[PDB]
């Protein structure tokens, strides 16, 4: 299935476009930058299940 | 246990690297030697078992079946040597390879410490038999017979795999030793009822049960002589062995559950013995006699008493040998007549006296004449059934009488009377056929001297 | 109807061949007399001579791993002792009741 | 390096091998006409390669040794029996026709392979084209049934829809009484029994169907017996004419690559000559098929692959 | 076509599949699907005839509709959560539409109708590629988003696929339609274990791909596309018929053959999750696949059908092109049951 | 004649070789189940002056 | 047990470094012998398909098949053993870290347990 | 057809087999030594 080549090689092929709060050109912020930042920080490393609850 | 398995595996390269006219000689000699090797397993203990390793064990229920399975192969080779004469070397080697694979699967099936391994080998035995039936068969209905034999078995056995994996998920082990020591009662529940049915019907179909016995006449009539021998002698006993092995987990549910099967078998033995009276075919008659005997074995296993188990084991061994002999005799008649109908060739005692003597002995041992092991199993099962209920004897009585009738009927139609005037190609019986009958019959009369050797673990 | 009335080009069904005609003493094993005779000999020797005789003798003289004489001697010594003591033969209980802890009903 | 996609990718292009002299030509003559003599002189004069007319054992000449195999192991038919009893009960007539058509197909494939791999042109006798005239004559004389010609038409369509027609078709035209006279002068006792109606049907068939259909996609040179004697005029006519109406000018390198992969692997060339349609003249039972295949296998150099036969004398088997 | 063009198109198909498998962004997954779709069409039309064109246009229509549904599911997911990463689906029926798109891509029921038609229209090599390689990407996506799927819908479509494949294989005389219905039934078996264990899905995929490769290469070697055309193979290559019969028995799920390993494991896995009735029904329905495999085996090697005269000439020639991997495929699809625990390698 | 009858009678040796190999394999597999040797409650025994293992 | 998401897992590592702390499979392992047997069967079928003497057509080809099968089998067995070791390690660690979910059952002798008896009649 | 044993392919096959066997033996030895060193056996 998913072969995580980007993490193995450190290429960053498409991770720059996945979320709103990831290095937009000219530092233009998304409409919900703070909320997405908070939700991502809270759920980092917790895992999807514990993250969901 | 590998001291038996490895020579059986080596039988294949030896056969395929054999000279074009030395396959039969090499195969028979090494099969007889392997049979001699198998005899060591007979010295059982009154204790648990002969646990060789984590994968294979021996038991005094498994040991007689293993010895019979090993002994059957030289007989099958000698029987098949005749009608495969005009056949290419490659296809004869393929036939011998299929027989060797069948023996190997049966040997691994009978030891089988684990139930999933037992199921895998139990269903692996199906492919060589199907190919033998559908490839080296004479009539055009061998394809339909093979389809019936395959699909009855698989329809019976597919729920068994689900039941086994569920049982391992709950209990945690499928090992026979662990299951026996950790057995716990099954509550009378609908789920437990269906689990019982799934555990039992797979072995019930192969006996076969009276309701599910249709595949057997087709498979026996359409298979070659080796196929008929292996079906009647060993393949039918797989269901009985499986039931005796798996019934331990089933109690106390078996008592309520057993009635539909007990009634079906007690009436089906009468039905099939009566069917034998009006038959125009030798092979079909022998097949129906086998069905009756295995119905009695089903009754014995379902009663589930010590005497029942000893009688069932003895009857299984005796029936295997007797039915193999009967099929061999019918095939010897067929190879001369090419009709395979009783009423055509008559009065064969006048032309072939020694073969008529063999016919008489085979019919007597099918008739359960004392003190043969056939009657030993017969009487043990009858006594156990009488203790179970004093009315069963009546049915048993009828069965015995009917059995004798058709047995002597088969002896009288083909051997006594006046020989058909037109048939003139009845040549004197060969040494090979007489040796085949002698090797079939001598073990029975030797075993009646030592019955405990085939009475199972509950002796 | 110009059809040949033949469905296909087929070999005629051959007649059965007798092993006795081309070779008396044919033993019903093979058409080659040497292979015939040697197959007869090996079958007879490895079946009747080796298996049926030596194997039957081996099975007859198997050691008592079932422990029948052992059980007979144990029972003999046990009854000899019990009769003398005045003990009533075999007890009804297979296990001693003092080491069995029943659950109290209090119903 | 056996020819394949890799060879075509790297260097192998067959367009550069064409030097306007290839010009596949087929010569057709009526029974007892000297078509062969004319064709051999054409091949010698134009520098092409002559192909002798395909017989019953033509395929035997290209596989293993060139010596023909047994009649039952190759063809299962004879022309002598067809001449003696054209209305034979065992259906030898249509079996003969089908085997001859298959041999002609194999011959055409071999000629095309040689022409594409070397560039040297070839000269042929009766090819898969115009082979139907014998079929038509045999049907009209009552030698074969309508199912036979239907099966022949099916096989011919499926096979011949994959090849390029010959550049030039050369026909030698000879009268029926004259060819009968040549038949008696030949001296073959079996050939003496050919009736005038059969030759007339066959002769008639070439003119009625073969010339008109091939005139729209090939170039035709109708010749008489006298003017076919001198091959100088024949070669002069061949050289003067230029082919621009057939499918050949439209072909390119990739079409030639596909055709060259087609002509190789003769098994796929003959794939549709054994289609599962059951005509009693050609269908063979299981027992006879098994016995004949076993006999073919027991041939000296046919049990294994060509390089893996010990009895023939192939060495180093255990290291090939 | 030009061999260079064919190689480029095959590499483009494989690169699209790899782009689907390695990317974490939904747009890149859709782009990989588009690339695979674009490069697959000429491969189905290598042999130009109206049948191949019809098969190619049917395949294009189905796959384009599936891609549009996939994009709609992605956009709805983005609307309800500003995420592009392939993770839990984050939404209701957006997941339903994603599952429908992936089912149409895979050929699962009720979107099974195009598989037999496209397989019949195209040649045997194109059918081999279509039935083997075109399952990796959608199954990879489904394995990635397996925790999101509603078990009811996935199990319903899996059972429907098994039933439809079993019933539709019984009526076929063409070999390619038989292979297509076999593929439908095998995909049904594969997707019924996705809600519980994706490793079992991958194991079933590997075993099925091996068996299908062996079967298609055997069919190509003995160039027959019909039951009767296959019935003539014994008169030339009896060993091919024997290997084919063994492979067909393996595909039927018979022990001790290799094809028994997936179903067994799958059944086992489904019993760990307190599911019995569906495994029972799946086995009883796969009995039908076994029946038509066994009929093909009867017509192939267990009986000798009548032959033709011209067959004799085929006795004098040998196959110029030989398939190197065919021997290995047969052994792997026949004799790998004892190596079953190796599935812990997370294949 | 030696070196000639061997090429035809070599096959006979295979079954006995399989038997001895199976016996050796049975002993070798037995060697891996010695965890309870001379430890059963029924057969706790003190080793002989020149004995290392009760059974092999 | 989906171990794809295990923390500290290199994405495309066939055999991680920590797998080197496990005993390698012996060269006489029965599974390696079975893989070699599979390679030998592949060689025999290869000889049979191309119409060559099955037993003695190509010795180099059969040797190559057997050797490649043994090589791949050895590495596959290493990965198998490593993955099973990981599963057992995780299970034991989880049992250790969650005592309240796996209580120590009070040992009870059969002499003080009442099991219902069903006669066989 | 008419061909000699291709000594190039034979040499390549034997060399590949011998190299694979030697590399496998070396890998097994290194694995055994590394396991012993990690678990501190010898
Ligand atoms: C009785 C004591 C015997 C002691 C001496 C030892 C005898 C050993 C015999 C072994 C059996 C023979 C081998 C079996 C096949 C036949 C072999 C053969 O080819 O013969 C050709 C040979 C020459 O033939 P021919 O002239 O060339 O051909 C003429 C035509 O073919 C025409 O042929 P035919 O018409 O002449 O047919 C031959 C003849 C005989 O041929 C046969 O039918 C053989 C089979 C007969 C039994 C059928 C099965 C029934 C179950 C019995 C199980 C007993 C097992 C005991 C242990 C056996 C160990 C091997 O026909 C009969 O006599 C039918 C007999 C029916 C007997 C009914 C009663 C049975 C129970 C009797 C009690 C047994 C236990 C007693 C225990 C209590 C007291 C100690 O003829 C004989 O050898 C005849 C043998 C004598 C008859 C024996 C009948 C009783 C045997 C019972 C078993 C052994 C009991 C041992 C303890 C006795 C005390
Ligand atoms: C695991 C999952 C497996 C998924 C299923 C496997 C996919 C199988 C399809 C592979 C491609 C087609 C193929 O190989 O035919 C099947 C092949 C049978 O071939 P065939 O039917 O005799 O060949 C006729 C071709 O269709 C006729 O084609 P052709 O002769 O016109 O082709 C010329 C040839 C020759 O290639 C060249 O001339 C090279 C030219 C270089 C151009 C560079 C362009 C760069 C831009 O190029 C190819 O054959 C395709 C090469 C693609 C290489 C991709 C890497 O058997 C297999 O591939 C089975 C292999 C086992 C599965 C995969 C490997 C084990 C895993
Ligand atoms: C349980 C595990 C233990 C056992 C393992 C079981 C499997 C093992 C083998 C697996 C496959 C490998 C070999 C198969 C390749 C096929 C080649 C072949 O056909 O044989 C010809 C060849 C002889 O013929 P040839 O002179 O070369 O040329 C004739 C042509 O080849 C051909 O002549 P033809 O074309 O004119 O003849 C036509 C014939 C020829 O067609 C065939 O024979 C096809 C071959 C069978 C298909 C194989 C499928 C793949 C394997 C599946 C195995 C299934 C097992 C699971 C249970 C289910 C049972 C189906 O086909 C037919 O007649 C059509 C109808 C056939 C009837 C129905 C088909 C059923 C076949 C199923 C057979 C299953 C068992 C096979 C056992 C081995 C058979 C060779 O046989 C051999 O000589 C090789 C046999 C093995 C070599 C043994 C060497 C070892 C001895 C020295 C070392 C000592 C060992 C111990 C070391 C320490 C001691 C000091
Ligand atoms: C065709 C050739 C032969 C094939 C094999 C035939 C053998 C299999 C037949 C199975 C035997 C009976 C199955 C279930 C028996 C349960 C006992 C029942 O009959 O007695 C009463 C049951 O009452 C009714 O029978 C309820 C069930 C009625 C529905 C069953 C269908 C009846 C006929 C169908 C026969 C078709 C069989 C073949 C299907 C393909 C007792 O009342 P109750 O105390 O409440 O239930 C006790 C069980 N508990 C404790 C688990 C709750
Ligand atoms: C032709 C006309 C007749 C001529 C010959 C006349 C002589 C007749 C004598 C023959 C039989 C008459 C009865 C005489 C019996 C005496 C021998 C008997 O006592 O020995 C039996 C011995 O026989 C064996 O127990 C039974 C034979 C073993 C059967 C195994 C079958 C052989 C293997 C072949 C393959 C198996 C195929 C079937 C698979 C199951 C019983 O022995 P047992 O009372 O206990 O104790 C022996 C002494 N102990 C205590 C020291 C041990
Ligand atoms: C049908 C029989 C199976 C044969 C299959 C083909 C055999 C030829 C393959 C040749 C070698 C392939 C190995 C690839 C080299 C490196 C692989 C490595 O980089 O990948 C790792 C993974 O290794 C491979 O997956 C292991 C493949 C080994 C397959 C063997 C199992 C076969 C099933 C049991 C049947 C026995 C077959 C024995 C005969 C071959 C990391 O995976 P990861 O990025 O972290 O997660 C993706 C996978 N997930 C999502 C499932 C977790
Ligand atoms: C002729 C054979 C006898 C047939 C008698 C009945 C025939 C009619 C039945 C048709 C098939 C019915 C399929 C659905 C049955 C559902 C049974 C079931 O689910 O019980 C499973 C039970 C408990 O379920 P859980 O949810 O896990 O328990 C938790 C709560 N206690 O667990 C088990 O025992 C699993 C065992 C599998 C059951 C077998 C199902 C098939 C029917 C039994 C076999 C009888 C038919 C044999 C065919 C004979 C042909 C030779
Ligand atoms: N399509 C065909 N059908 C039947 N016989 C054919 C066919 N084609 C060629 N022949 C036979 O080939 C034989 C030789 O051909 P022909 O040109 O007449 O003699 P020659 O080879 O001496 O020039 C003829 O006897 C003819 O019958």
TrEMBL record, chain A:
Domain of life the protein comes from: Eukaryota
Repressor found in the keyword field: no
Record keywords: Disulfide bond, Electron transport, Membrane, Mitochondrion, Mitochondrion inner membrane, Respiratory chain, Transport
GO term, biological process aspect, one: mitochondrial respiratory chain complex I assembly
Family to which the UniProt record says this protein belongs: Belongs to the complex I NDUFS5 subunit family.
Task performed by this protein: Accessory subunit of the mitochondrial membrane respiratory chain NADH dehydrogenase (Complex I), that is believed not to be involved in catalysis. Complex I functions in the transfer of electrons from NADH to the respiratory chain. The immediate electron acceptor for the enzyme is believed to be ubiquinone.
Subunit composition and interactions: Mammalian complex I is composed of 45 different subunits. This is a component of the iron-sulfur (IP) fragment of the enzyme.
Protein name, as recorded: NADH dehydrogenase [ubiquinone] iron-sulfur protein 5
Span of the entire protein shown here: 2 to 54 of 106
TrEMBL record, chain B:
Keyword annotations of the record: Electron transport, Membrane, Mitochondrion, NAD, Respiratory chain, Translocase, Transmembrane, Transmembrane helix, Transport, Ubiquinone
GO cellular component, one term: mitochondrial membrane
EC assignment: 7.1.1.2
Biological process annotations from GO: ATP synthesis coupled electron transport
Residue stretches spanning the membrane: 21-41, 61-80, 92-110, 116-133, 145-167, 193-216, 223-244, 256-277, 284-303, 309-330, 351-369, 389-412, 433-449
Assembly notes: Core subunit of respiratory chain NADH dehydrogenase (Complex I) which is composed of 45 different subunits.
Function, as annotated: Core subunit of the mitochondrial membrane respiratory chain NADH dehydrogenase (Complex I) which catalyzes electron transfer from NADH through the respiratory chain, using ubiquinone as an electron acceptor. Essential for the catalytic activity and assembly of complex I.
The protein's name: NADH-ubiquinone oxidoreductase chain 4
Source species: Sus scrofa (Pig)
Lineage: Eukaryota, Metazoa, Chordata, Craniata, Vertebrata
UniProtKB/TrEMBL annotation, chain F:
InterPro entries assigned: NDUB1
Pfam families in the record: NADH_oxidored
Keywords: Electron transport, Membrane, Mitochondrion, Mitochondrion inner membrane, Respiratory chain, Transmembrane, Transmembrane helix, Transport
Transmembrane helix is among the record's keywords: yes
Compartmental location: Mitochondrion inner membrane
GO cellular component: mitochondrial inner membrane; nuclear speck; respiratory chain complex I
Membrane topology, as annotated: Single-pass membrane protein
Taxonomic superkingdom: Eukaryota
Stated family: Belongs to the complex I NDUFB1 subunit family.
Subunit comment: Complex I is composed of 45 different subunits.
Function: Accessory subunit of the mitochondrial membrane respiratory chain NADH dehydrogenase (Complex I) that is believed not to be involved in catalysis. Complex I functions in the transfer of electrons from NADH to the respiratory chain. The immediate electron acceptor for the enzyme is believed to be ubiquinone.
Name of this chain's protein: NADH dehydrogenase [ubiquinone] 1 beta subcomplex subunit 1
Organism: Sus scrofa
Organism ancestry: Eukaryota, Metazoa, Chordata, Craniata, Vertebrata
UniProtKB/TrEMBL annotation, chain H:
Transmembrane listed as a keyword: yes
Chief localisation class: mitochondrion
Keyword Nuclease among UniProt keywords: no
Keyword vocabulary terms for this entry: Electron transport, Membrane, Mitochondrion, Mitochondrion inner membrane, Respiratory chain, Transit peptide, Transmembrane, Transmembrane helix, Transport
Cellular component annotations (GO), alphabetically ordered: mitochondrial inner membrane; respiratory chain complex I
Subcellular location: Mitochondrion inner membrane
Membrane topology, as annotated: Single-pass membrane protein
Family: Belongs to the complex I NDUFC1 subunit family.
Assembly behavior: Complex I is composed of 45 different subunits.
Function statement: Accessory subunit of the mitochondrial membrane respiratory chain NADH dehydrogenase (Complex I), that is believed not to be involved in catalysis. Complex I functions in the transfer of electrons from NADH to the respiratory chain. The immediate electron acceptor for the enzyme is believed to be ubiquinone.
Protein name: NADH dehydrogenase [ubiquinone] 1 subunit C1, mitochondrial
Organism (species): Sus scrofa
From-to range in the entire protein, with total length: 35 to 76 of 76
């Amino acid at each position: 299935p998913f072969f995580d080549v980007q993490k193995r090689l450190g290429l960053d092929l498409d991770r720059w476009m996945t979320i709103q709060s990831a290095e937009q050109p000219h530092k233009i912020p998304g409409r919900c930058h703070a909320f997405e930042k908070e939700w991502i920080e809270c759920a980092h490393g917790i895992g999807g299940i514990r993250a969901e609850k | 246990m590998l001291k038996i398995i490895i020579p059986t595996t080596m039988l294949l390269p030896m056969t395929w690297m054999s000279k074009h006219n030395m396959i039969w000689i090499n195969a028979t000699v090494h099969s007889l030697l392997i049979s001699l090797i198998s005899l060591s397993l007979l010295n059982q203990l009154g204790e648990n078992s002969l646990n060789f390793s984590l994968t294979f064990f021996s038991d005094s229920l498994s040991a007689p079946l293993l010895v019979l399975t090993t002994w059957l192969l030289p007989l099958m080779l000698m029987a098949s040597q005749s009608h495969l004469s005009k056949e290419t070397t490659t296809r004869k080697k393929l036939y011998i390879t299929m027989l060797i694979l069948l023996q190997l699967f049966l040997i691994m099936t009978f030891t089988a410490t684990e139930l999933i391994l037992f199921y895998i080998l139990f269903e692996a035995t199906l492919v060589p038999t199907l190919i033998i039936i559908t490839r080296w068969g004479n009539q055009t209905e061998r394809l339909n017979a093979g389809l019936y034999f395959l699909f009855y078995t698989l329809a019976g056995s597919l729920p068994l795999l689900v039941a086994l994996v569920y049982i391992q998920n709950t209990t945690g082990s499928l090992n026979f030793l662990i299951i026996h020591y950790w057995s716990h009662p099954l509550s009378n529940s609908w789920s437990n009822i269906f689990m019982w049915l799934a555990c039992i019907m797979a072995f019930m179909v192969k006996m076969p049960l009276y309701g599910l016995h249709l595949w057997l006449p087709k498979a026996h009539v359409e298979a070659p002589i080796a196929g008929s021998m292996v079906l009647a002698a060993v393949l039918l006993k797989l269901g009985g062995y499986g039931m005796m092995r798996i019934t331990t987990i089933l109690n106390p549910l078996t008592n309520y559950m057993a009635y539909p099967f007990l009634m079906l078998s007690m009436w089906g033995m009468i039905m099939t013995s009566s069917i034998c009276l009006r038959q125009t075919d030798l092979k079909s008659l022998i097949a129906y006699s086998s069905v009756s005997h295995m119905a009695l074995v089903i009754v014995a296993i379902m009663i589930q008493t010590p005497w029942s188990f000893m009688g069932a084991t003895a009857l299984m061994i005796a029936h295997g040998l007797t039915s193999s002999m009967l099929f061999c005799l019918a095939n010897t008649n067929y190879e001369r007549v090419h009709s395979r109908t009783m009423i055509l060739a008559r009065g064969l005692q006048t032309l072939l006296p020694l073969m008529a003597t063999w016919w008489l002995v085979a019919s007597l041992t099918n008739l359960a004449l004392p003190p043969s092991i056939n009657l030993i199993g017969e009487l043990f099962i009858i006594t156990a059934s009488f203790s179970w209920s004093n009315i069963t004897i009546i049915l048993m009585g009828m069965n015995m009488m009917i059995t004798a009738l058709y047995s002597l009927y088969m002896l009288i139609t083909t051997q006594r009377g006046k020989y058909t005037h037109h048939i003139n190609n009845i040549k004197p019986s060969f040494t090979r056929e007489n040796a085949l009958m002698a090797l079939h019959i001598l073990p029975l009369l030797l075993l009646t001297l030592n019955p405990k050797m085939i009475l199972g673990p509950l002796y | 109807p110009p059809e040949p009335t033949i469905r296909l080009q087929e070999d005629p069904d051959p007649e059965d061949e007798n092993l006795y005609e081309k070779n008396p003493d044919s033993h019903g094993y093979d058409k080659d007399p040497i292979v015939d005779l040697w197959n007869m000999r090996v079958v007879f020797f490895f079946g009747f001579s080796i298996v049926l005789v030596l194997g039957s003798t081996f099975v007859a003289y198997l050691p008592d791993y079932r422990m029948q004489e052992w059980a007979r001697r144990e029972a003999e010594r046990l009854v000899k002792y019990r009769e003398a003591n005045g003990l009533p033969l075999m007890e009804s209980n297979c296990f001693d009741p003092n080491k069995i802890q029943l659950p109290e009903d209090e119903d | 390096l056996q020819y394949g996609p890799l060879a075509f990718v790297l260097g192998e292009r067959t367009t550069r091998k064409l030097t306007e002299t290839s010009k596949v030509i087929t010569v057709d003559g009526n029974i007892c006409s000297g078509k062969g003599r004319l064709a051999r002189e054409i091949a010698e004069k134009l520098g092409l390669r002559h192909f002798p007319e395909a017989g019953i054992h033509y395929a035997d000449s290209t596989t293993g040794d060139g010596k023909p195999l047994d009649v039952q192991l190759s063809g299962n038919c004879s022309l002598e029996k067809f001449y003696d009893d054209p209305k034979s009960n065992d259906g030898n007539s249509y079996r003969l026709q089908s085997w001859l058509y298959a041999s002609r197909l194999l011959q055409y494939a071999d000629a095309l392979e040689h022409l594409l791999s070397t560039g040297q042109g070839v000269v042929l006798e009766r090819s898969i084209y115009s082979d139907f005239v014998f079929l038509e004559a045999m049907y009209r004389q009552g030698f074969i049934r309508k199912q036979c010609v239907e099966h022949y038409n099916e096989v011919k369509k499926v096979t011949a829809c994959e090849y390029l027609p010959p550049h030039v078709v050369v026909y030698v035209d000879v009268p029926v009484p004259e060819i009968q006279s040549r038949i008696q002068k030949k001296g073959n006792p079996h050939e003496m029994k050919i009736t005038a109606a059969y030759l007339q049907d066959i002769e008639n068939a070439y003119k009625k169907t073969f010339l008109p259909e091939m005139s729209e996609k090939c170039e035709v040179l109708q010749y008489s017996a006298r003017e076919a004697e001198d091959a100088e005029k024949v070669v002069e006519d061949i050289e003067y004419l230029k082919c621009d109406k057939g499918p050949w000018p439209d072909q390119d390198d990739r079409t030639f690559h596909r055709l060259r992969m087609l002509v190789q692997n003769k098994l796929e060339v003959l794939n549709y000559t054994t289609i599962p349609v059951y005509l009693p003249e050609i269908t063979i039972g299981a027992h006879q098929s098994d016995r004949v295949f076993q006999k073919f296998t027991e041939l000296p150099g046919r049990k294994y692959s060509p390089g893996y036969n010990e009895d023939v004398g192939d060495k180093w088997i255990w290291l090939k | 076509m030009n061999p260079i063009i064919y190689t480029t198109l095959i590499m483009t198909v494989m690169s699209g599949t790899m782009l689907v498998m390695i990317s974490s962004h939904w747009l890149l997954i859709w782009i990989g699907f588009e690339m695979n779709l674009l490069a697959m069409i000429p491969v189905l039309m290598k042999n130009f005839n109206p049948r191949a064109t019809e098969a190619a246009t049917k395949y294009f229509l189905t796959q384009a509709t599936a891609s549009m549904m996939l994009m709609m599911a992605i956009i709805i997911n983005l609307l309800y959560s500003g995420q592009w990463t392939i993770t839990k689906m984050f939404n209701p029926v957006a997941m339903t539409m994603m599952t429908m798109a992936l089912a149409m891509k895979l050929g699962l029921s009720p979107f099974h109708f195009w598989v037999p038609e496209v397989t019949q229209g195209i040649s045997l090599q194109a059918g081999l590629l279509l039935l083997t390689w075109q399952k990796l990407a959608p199954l990879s996506v489904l394995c990635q988003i397996s925790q999101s799927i509603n078990p009811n819908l996935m199990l319903t479509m899996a059972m429907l696929s098994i039933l439809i494949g079993g019933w539709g294989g019984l009526n076929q005389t063409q070999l390619r339609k038989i292979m297509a219905y076999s593929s439908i039934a095998h995909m049904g078996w594969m997707t019924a274990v996705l809600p519980y264990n994706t490793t079992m899905t991958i194991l079933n995929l590997l075993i099925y791909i091996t068996m299908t490769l062996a079967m298609f290469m055997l069919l190509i070697h003995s160039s027959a596309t019909t039951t009767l055309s296959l019935s003539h193979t014994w008169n030339k290559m009896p060993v091919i018929t024997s290997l084919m019969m063994v492979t067909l028995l393996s595909m039927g799920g018979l022990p001790p053959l290799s094809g028994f390993m997936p179903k067994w494991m799958i059944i086992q896995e489904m019993t760990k999750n307190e599911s019995i009735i569906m495994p029972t029904l799946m086995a009883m329905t796969a009995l039908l696949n076994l029946y038509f495999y066994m009929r093909l085996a009867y017509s192939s090697s267990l009986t000798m059908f009548p032959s033709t005269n011209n067959m004799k000439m085929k006795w004098q020639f040998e196959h110029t092109k030989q398939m190197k991997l065919l021997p290995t495929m047969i052994v792997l699809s026949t004799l790998v049951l004892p190596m079953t625990p190796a599935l812990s390698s997370l294949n | 004649n030696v070196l000639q009858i061997v090429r035809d009678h070599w096959v006979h040796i295979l079954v006995p070789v399989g038997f001895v190999f199976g016996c050796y394999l049975d002993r070798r597999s037995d060697e891996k189940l010695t965890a309870f040797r001379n430890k059963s409650l029924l057969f706790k025994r003190e080793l002989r002056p020149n004995e290392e293992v009760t059974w092999k | 047990t989906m171990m794809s998401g295990r923390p500290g897992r290199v994405p495309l590592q066939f055999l991680p470094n920590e797998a080197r702390s496990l005993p390698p499979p012996k060269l006489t392992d029965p599974r390696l012998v079975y893989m070699g047997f599979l390679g030998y069967c592949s060689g025999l079928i290869d000889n049979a398909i191309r119409r060559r003497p099955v037993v003695s057509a190509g010795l180099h080809r059969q040797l190559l098949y057997v050797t490649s099968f043994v090589f791949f089998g050895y590495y596959l067995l290493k990965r198998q053993d490593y993955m099973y070791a990981l599963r057992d390690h995780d299970m034991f660690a989880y049992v250790k870290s969650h005592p309240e979910d796996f209580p120590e059952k009070d040992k009870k002798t059969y002499g003080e347990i009442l099991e219902e008896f069903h006669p066989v009649r | 057809p008419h061909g000699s044993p291709d000594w190039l392919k034979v040499g390549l096959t034997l060399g590949t087999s011998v190299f694979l066997w030697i590399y496998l033996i070396k890998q097994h030895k290194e694995d055994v030594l590394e396991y012993k060193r990690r678990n501190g056996l010898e």
